[PDB]
Amino acid sequence: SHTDIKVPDFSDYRRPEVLDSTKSSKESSEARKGFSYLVTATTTVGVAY
Amino acid sequence: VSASSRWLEGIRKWYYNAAGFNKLGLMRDDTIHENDDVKEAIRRLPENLYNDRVFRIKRALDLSMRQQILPKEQWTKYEEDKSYLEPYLKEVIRERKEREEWAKK
Amino acid sequence: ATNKLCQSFQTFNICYADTGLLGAHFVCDHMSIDDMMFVLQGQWMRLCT
């Protein structure tokens, strides 16, 4: 009965790269982290200045 | 007894929808302030009613975080609001008043 | 063992076609989940570096 549990669909939340079930997340693993960590680094630069 | 009673109940149903806790799926007893009488009554709740109370409050806090409400279909209807906690709380209060009356003599 | 952080844990590397699950699983008292997670991840990072 715990096998009746399925994770709901996040398609209206996911980023564009990771919406394809038949495509690896490793492909966009590199870009997605850089986009978010770029925002952090810029913030520190502004605080630094 | 429809004429005068239904106008009073009509104003209560107005206030119930105006209060708006039904818009988060909550019931009236979910919103009561937890004092010592209320913690004991909640403690006395059976398993199912306790677990239902927990999830409704959890669902409402999740909504309050997102500044959202449930769809109108899922609002708590005024006529279907169950005062599941009131009978337990009434007994807890009755017991405390008995202690207080014994503490006077 | 010394701090009684869990009743058991196991590491695993579950393989499939072009994908898999690499990690660990453990079982513990409710006041020990955080310490087990901490020590577990610390060892992953320690081996990485």
Binding site: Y13, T42, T43, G46 | F55, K58, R59, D62 | -
Partner: protein, 48 residues
């Protein structure tokens, strides 16, 4: 009465530009972390 007038206006311009950068970036950091919670889904499955 206000010899700092010109210098304060130059600083005010720099303050507005940096805030115009930092406010949306810091806002973005807040939403990034909070997105774990804002898209979380709940389900209640009690035994019957």
């Amino acid at each position: 009465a206000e010899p700092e007038h010109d210098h304060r206006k130059r600083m005010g311009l720099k303050m507005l530009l940096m805030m115009g950068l930092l406010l949306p970036l810091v806002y973005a950091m807040k939403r990034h972390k909070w997105s774990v919670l804002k898209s979380r889904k709940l389900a209640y499955r009690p035994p019957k």
